[PDB]
Every structure is written in C-alpha cells, then in structure tokens.
Amino acid sequence: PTLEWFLSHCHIHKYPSKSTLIHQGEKAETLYYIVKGSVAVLIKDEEGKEMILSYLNQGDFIGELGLFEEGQERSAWVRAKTACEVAEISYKKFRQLIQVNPDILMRLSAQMARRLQVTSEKVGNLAFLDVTGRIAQTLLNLAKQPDAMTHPDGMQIKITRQEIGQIVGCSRETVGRILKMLEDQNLISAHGKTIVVYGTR
Amino acid sequence: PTLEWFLSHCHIHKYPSKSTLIHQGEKAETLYYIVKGSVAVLIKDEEGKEMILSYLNQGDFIGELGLFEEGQERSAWVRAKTACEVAEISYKKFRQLIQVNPDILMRLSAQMARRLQVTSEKVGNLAFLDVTGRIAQTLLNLAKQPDAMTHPDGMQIKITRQEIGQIVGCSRETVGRILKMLEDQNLISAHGKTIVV
DNA sequence: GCGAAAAATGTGAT
DNA sequence: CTAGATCACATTTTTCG
DNA sequence: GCGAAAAATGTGAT
DNA sequence: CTAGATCACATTTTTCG
C-alpha cells in the first residue's frame, strides 16, 4: 500500500516514555510519523504553565507545519506520552517523494485539515463554556480517545487531575472539586482510573 | 500559473456587504476562492455569542475542510466584510484537478498549515492572558493587516469596540473601559479609529 | 508483583 | 480576593441619501 | 458638504 | 455580583529498578 512506499524511506526510531520528541522553537528539520505509540503536544505561557492542545497516536504525522515554506520554527512542544516509534524523512526528500506518488500528500492534508476543526472547537470551548463545561466535554472526548479501556458501565481512562486542568485551562484544585461534583450525581466513578459512564459505551 | 488554469472552472459571484457565503451546519461541496474582497469566519453559540475566528482575504481558499472526509458539515460561518468576488468548483471536480497538476493542492495545504498555526496561538492567548493582554496583542496583529493604512508614523486600523470584543472574547463595555487605558499607558490613541503606535 | 521513592492531591477563605 | 460580566437608555459616534 | 436615522458607547455598583 | 486561583504541606496513590 501507498503508506509502505513512504514507510521504507522513513527511518523508525525508538523514543522512551516522557522523552520530549520535539521542542518548540527549533528549525524545521524533518517530517515525523508515529509507527507505534502516542504523543502529546503542548505549549506554555509568558513563562511557566504548559497547556495540552492535542495528542496524536499511531498513524499521524508530527511536525509538518513548516513544510510548505522555509525557516519555520517549531510550532510547539511534542513530548512522547507512552513510549512510541516515530519514523522520519527529511523535508527536502518528502517533496521529491510527493511527486513520485502524491496520494500521501493527499493523506497529510487530511490531518492538517481535521486538526483545525478540533482546534477551532477549542477556541469555542474556552470562550463559550465554563470549566465544568470544558471538563465534562473533555472526558467524553477522552473516552473516544484510543487510550480508553472499556469498563462495564462506560469508557475507562487513567489520566490525572493535573493533566485535566492542563487541557481544560484551570488550576488542578478546581478539577479536584468538580470531578468530585460530577461523582456525587453519578455521572462519574473515579479513583485515578476514571470511568465516565454514559451507558451505551 | 497553476492559478489561472484552476480558477477558470469556477462560477464567480459578487456577494454584497455582509452576505452569508457559508452557514455553519450545512452540507459541503464548494471550495471557494476570494478573487477580491474579505471574509470574517465565525463560530456561534446556540445562545447569542460569536467569535471572529479569523479574517480571510483575496488569495485565500475557503470551505476547504470537507474535501478529504466524504460526508461532512461546514465547520463554521463565513460572512462578508466587503463586496467580494468568490470563485467556486465542485469538490469532486477539485479532486480531479488535484490529480493532473498537483501544485494547487500544495497551495491549499499551505493555506491550512498557516491557519492551523495562527489558530493554535488563539487557543493560547485565551488560556494565558488578561483581557488587557488580549486586547493588546489584538491591537498589534490588527496592524499586520491588508486594509490598514500606514498612518503618520504607525498603523491606523479602524475597528469598533464590539468588534475587538468578538475577537477577544470579552464584553464590549470592558473593551472600551480597557483599550483607552492603553492610551495613558501610551500604546494607542483612538476615536473610532485605533491609531496603534 | 515488590515496596522504596516519586508524584498527585485536596482542603477554605479571599 | 481579583477580573471581568451583567443591568437600560441618552449621549455620542457614524452611516449614505 | 449637509441633515435625519442608525451604530456604537459609556457608566457604575456590585 | 460571582467564579476559581490559590498557598504549603499532610496524606494517598502511582512510578520504576
């Protein structure tokens, strides 16, 4: 399949858990593709707080927002979540490749298009909702996220309050008090391993 | 170049001051092109409010997200800040134009990455800044803009308080109560006009 | 599948 | 314990015929 | 090159 | 008016050699 033409030119490498895959600011060097495992992508403010903006899992393409112009600094931080294998090709060679088969360039644009639907939703969520709203919404998202392991009354996830405050944009104390709130209503069962129960699965 | 070959196949239309060229929610088929004019992409909440998620101008492709996922919704709302001239091609045709001269595709994919980029910044200005912070860089970015006039020494953009309010995500009454404060803290001077120094 | 050490947490007036 | 929202309604600024 | 209506605004506790 | 951040350390639970 078309993928294998790229995945052959693209050098697979092992990256351990927590291993800072890409750093913000550097200069657009390679094009990356996750052949096993997962990744987190985050930015930080005036200086200090990091905020997650997306994860990405098997089959995505990291760092492609340079590719179409020259001299772009890295957009943001990309830090491995679980250990993963991120294969890669040099920008210059990607282009030459695009012409010998452009239906992978097609496949890239797909991700570069959907990621902005998701991201424009985010602006939505941080402008129109309040933290309880964002949290509730996010838990549903994460249930959808491939990470989840089923539990006989809803999708299970083992994430942490610190991280929710980080995706949600709020101090982890408020995560503590709201996750408690949605528990004393039966929307949530929660001990480190959280299960947001919506019935159906 | 690749541009004039591409365009030709596009029914060209002249939408007037504040038309609605894409209603959010509806069906996707048209990949538009502003051959002249300017757009304001919005998102709206079922209850009253909206957020100016982007300005788009001449040269920009529009309604591009449908194209790879067959069967979809029109992500947001495109309105019209001035009389424009927009071109149009059926997606399934555009897809054929891809597979004969693949340069036009790049030009959209590049239109995207720059967007993906500026929007991810928007995300952050919301999770990290004061209203003052926000209004402030909004008065800066609004000067890196095709429609702003190089006033005596600096940029003179016109844009109203409710307008800045929609971009920022803050109330109108705060916006005014605040930007005129960036005047004592001599960063701007205004009067309908916002003569960012 | 350990248990020492490393990380996450939560509670309240302002 | 601080930032920014929410009240109507005249005064004020802007809109082209 | 000028006059109505029309958009937009400011404020002030809380 | 009202929502959440927040300071600081006991205590609880999750990571890793």
Ligand SMILES: Nc1ncnc2c1ncn2[C@@H]1O[C@@H]2COP(=O)(O)O[C@H]2[C@H]1O
């Ligand atoms: N909003 C976003 N959503 C998803 N991925 C993003 C977003 N912003 C940046 N990225 C990714 O993060 C990478 C960091 O810089 P690159 O230009 O290498 O490529 C970027 C994209 O792969």
Ligand SMILES: Nc1ncnc2c1ncn2[C@@H]1O[C@@H]2COP(=O)(O)O[C@H]2[C@H]1O
């Ligand atoms: N983040 C964004 N920045 C700029 N324009 C956008 C953004 N999100 C959506 N749009 C544009 O608005 C269009 C709405 O309909 P489409 O999804 O067809 O395609 C969308 C884009 O062209």
